[PDB]
Amino acid sequence: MLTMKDIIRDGHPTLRQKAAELELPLTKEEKETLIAMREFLVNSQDEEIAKRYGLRSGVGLAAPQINISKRMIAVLIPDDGSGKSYDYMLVNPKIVSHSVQEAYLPTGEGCLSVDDNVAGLVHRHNRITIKAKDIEGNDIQLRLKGYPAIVFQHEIDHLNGVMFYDHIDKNHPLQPHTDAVEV
Ligand SMILES: [Mg+2]
């Protein structure tokens, strides 16, 4: 079971590296890692488990955050009432196309690797298309908008050594960009 002690914190050099492309097929160990990442998120969102193991609730996790500098991510976004929910373990995800129009969460973002909150909007693309492999090496192509697009951009940023706060405007941190979508 992964817990908070497995998550490296801001300042750890692994968070600023560029993660390596996975060879397919994955090793059994690489499969287990990705499954465990997802299982962390499942745990983090279960109120009784998260309290018992001291977990902060998360909807995404990238391998560099557990000190594994490989291009794998897990995203687990529960149904927000629309019937839309997202449960994906992706290998070698890439954004192949995106909107010009931006989107932001109105309170900013948080990260399990960053112990203290950082104020400011994180403008990302409102719409993205991702091509990736799944854990068995089969092909996935996702079309995402709004909150799930944001989450996946945040996770993919970790693979390139980028943190959310890198996107914050130090002069006008809370000023929305013109025509950006508030999510
Ligand atoms: Mg993060």
The helix content is: 10-25%
β-strand percent reads 15-25%
Which CATH class? Answer: Alpha Beta
Say which molecules are bound, naming each kind only once: magnesium ion
The SS-based structural class is alpha+beta
InterPro entries: Peptide_deformylase (IPR023635), Peptide_deformylase_sf (IPR036821)
GO biological process, one term: co-translational protein modification
EC number: 3.5.1.88
Enzyme class: hydrolase
Explain what this protein looks like in three dimensions.
- Its cofactor is Fe(2+).
- Fe cation binds at residues 111, 154, 158.
- The active site is at residue 155.
- The chain has 183 residues and is an alpha+beta fold.
- The protein has a single domain (1-183), classed as Peptide deformylase (Peptide Deformylase, Alpha-Beta Complex), CATH 3.90.45.10.
- 20% of the residues lie in helices and 23% in strands.
- It is built from three helices and eight strands.
- It has helices at 28-45, 47-52, 147-159; strands at 60-62, 72-77, 86-98, 102-104, 124-125, 127-133, 139-145, 181-182.
- A five-stranded antiparallel β-sheet has the order 1-2-3-6-7. The chain has a three-stranded mixed β-sheet with strand order 5-4-8, with helices on one face.
- A hairpin with a 5-residue loop joins strand 6 and strand 7.
- The protein is globular, with a radius of gyration of 16 Å.
- The chain binds magnesium ion.
- Magnesium ion binds next to helix 3.
